[PDB]
């Protein structure tokens, strides 16, 4: 019942016989998932939650940064003070769910109110030792492979009137996205081994957007809701950037963030980029060319990272664009419901 701050531990299903890098890091750094999850509901309670000021997020930040240091080693790392050249071996890459638990003398409070916006009081509270499994999926614009909202879309913002405050959206309708790099023979041949594409069903996304647009009109009354491409920035933001199978995907989302979306299946152009801007620290990291064979990732869109157009309103239309780049917000989208 007291606000607390201490180091926590992770529990995974990491298998020691696994060469996948997340497991290697998880087997060595996490304890097995508790066999029986004990959760205690409190029948008459209230506590104030702040998803935007939570040490749990900053803790997973330090963890997900550590993972990427074992898994994805750049051939060259340029920062403001240092230059690194090293071996950049390829690795088998897959996110595995991570559970976050409280040590002895501490417990975790979980909001079970289905429509909690992440800031303020929740009339209904529970206590568990360990959080649900969260894949540390690193991405921009689109939130992938996260937990989904029970009843209705949720809008999370520290302050919506603050246009500089990122807007996390949690969906009630997962939308399947497949990004593939088609198979082709070798790097020496004439083929462009960095050409890639995604396929998202047009009707699914177009109708999901309408539901997001609907939930946003409730926080902005008497206004039109518009989705337009990114106003600019690094390539990681202006494109759906993420890592699929150890390779860095940059998927241009002009076809997704459009006011009128076609019914028919959508095809997004992507590119595998060696040269990437690091989210762990401010700097550039260069990775080796892509591996041979087919690279595919069937992922589920469960949330968004949006940024509203500021300034005087031209047409009484509030424009939201895709954004990201601070992976802590990705973690908040999951750990919003927990506090210690």
């Amino acid at each position: 019942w007291k606000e607390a701050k201490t180091t926590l531990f992770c529990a995974s299903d990491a298998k020691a016989y696994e060469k996948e890098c997340h497991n290697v890091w998880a087997t060595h750094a996490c304890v097995p998932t508790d066999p029986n999850p004990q959760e205690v509901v409190l029948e008459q309670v209230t506590e104030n939650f702040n998803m935007w000021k939570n040490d749990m997020v900053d803790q997973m930040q330090e963890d997900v940064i550590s993972i990427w240091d074992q898994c994805l080693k750049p051939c060259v790392k340029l920062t403001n003070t240092s230059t690194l050249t090293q071996a950049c071996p390829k690795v088998t890459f897959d996110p595995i769910p991570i559970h976050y638990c409280a040590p002895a003398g501490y417990a975790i409070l979980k909001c079970n109110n289905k429509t909690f916006n992440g800031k303020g009081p929740c009339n209904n509270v529970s206590t568990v030792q360990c959080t649900h499994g969260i894949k540390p999926v690193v991405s921009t614009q689109l939130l992938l492979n996260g937990s989904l909202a029970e009843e209705e879309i949720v809008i999370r913002s520290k302050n919506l009137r603050d246009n500089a405050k990122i807007i996390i959206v949690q969906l009630q309708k997962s939308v399947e996205i497949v990004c593939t790099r088609p198979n082709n023979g070798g790097s020496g041949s004439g083929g462009d081994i960095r050409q890639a594409y995604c396929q998202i069903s047009g009707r699914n996304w177009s109708e999901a957007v309408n539901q997001v647009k609907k939930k946003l009109k409730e926080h902005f009354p008497h206004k039109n809701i518009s989705f337009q491409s990114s106003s600019g920035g690094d390539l990681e933001i202006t494109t759906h950037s993420f890592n699929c199978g150890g390779e860095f995907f940059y998927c241009n989302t002009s076809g997704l963030f459009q006011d009128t979306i076609s019914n028919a299946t959508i095809m997004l152009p992507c590119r595998i980029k060696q040269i990437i801007n690091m989210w762990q620290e401010v700097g550039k990291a260069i990775y080796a060319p892509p591996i041979k064979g087919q690279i595919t990732c069937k992922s589920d869109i469960t949330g968004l990272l949006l940024l509203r157009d500021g300034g005087d309103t031209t047409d009484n239309t509030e424009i939201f664009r895709p954004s990201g780049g601070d992976m802590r917000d990705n973690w908040r989208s999951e750990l919003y419901k927990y506090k210690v």
Epitope: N163, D234, I237, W279, D312, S323, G325, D326
Partner: antibody, heavy 118, light 101 residues
Framework: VQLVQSGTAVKRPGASVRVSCQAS????????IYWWRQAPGQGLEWLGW????????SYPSRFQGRLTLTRDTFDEMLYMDLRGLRSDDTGIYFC????????????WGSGTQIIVSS | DIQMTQSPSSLSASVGDKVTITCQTS???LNWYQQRRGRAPKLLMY???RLVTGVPSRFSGRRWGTQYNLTIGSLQPEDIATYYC?????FGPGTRLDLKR
């Protein structure tokens, strides 16, 4: 804790211009930079803000596509690129550090005078 | 977005006078700045009531509801300049203070 801006720059109409602030004395990546301009004897107009951490810029509709904000973390310098220079683009251009979620601007540059003329 | 009104548009006072200024905003988080001749603004108070270190005690601010007031206890030659009220990305129209003649 200071921002130091470029000097007076003159460019012909329809050309492109650059202004730069250099941060010093504080962690560059933790504070938004808001850009403002004011013509002579007039109020401040919003150019946009940029997030030094993630590079994300936001602009007002009026200047959409004509103005772009960029960052350089190795130099700790902020840039403001304005193109298609009209006559009304003449004026003094300021950069300010957004200190807090209150949105107070505590640290300001001393302004960059821009002049548009043949 | 935010609607902002500042009045009066102009004001005149002399040393030792009591000068009050007001701006109104539907939205919260107002801040006040001092802009002297040909110089960038100086942060005076943030949140309308909270004073920033390094600013004299002559300055104080109180706000009630949708109204924010800026008051100077004893004007001095330095203070004669344009004062703006801000909130988020929007700046007020501005009020310019001139010596009484």
């Amino acid at each position: 804790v200071q921002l130091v801006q470029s000097g007076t720059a003159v460019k012909r109409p329809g050309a492109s211009v650059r202004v730069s602030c250099q941060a010093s004395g504080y962690t560059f990546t933790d504070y938004f930079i808001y850009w403002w301009r004011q013509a002579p004897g007039q109020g401040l107009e919003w150019l946009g803000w940029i997030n030094p951490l993630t590079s994300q810029p936001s602009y007002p509709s009026r200047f959409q596509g004509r103005l772009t904000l960029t960052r350089d973390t190795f130099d700790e310098m902020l840039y403001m690129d304005l193109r298609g220079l009209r006559s009304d683009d003449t004026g003094i251009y300021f950069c300010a550090r957004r200190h807090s979620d209150y949105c107070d601007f505590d640290i300001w540059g001393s302004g960059t005078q821009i002049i548009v003329s043949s | 977005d935010i609607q902002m009104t500042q009045s009066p548009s102009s004001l005149s006072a002399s040393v030792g006078d009591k000068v009050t200024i007001t701006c109104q905003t539907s939205a919260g988080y107002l801040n006040w700045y001092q802009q002297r001749r040909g110089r960038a603004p100086k942060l005076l108070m943030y949140d309308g009531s909270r004073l920033v270190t390094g600013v004299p005690s002559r300055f104080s601010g109180r706000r009630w509801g949708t109204q924010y007031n800026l008051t100077i206890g004893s004007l001095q030659p330095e203070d004669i300049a344009t004062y703006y009220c801000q909130v988020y990305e929007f700046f007020g129209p501005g009020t310019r203070l001139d010596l009484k003649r």
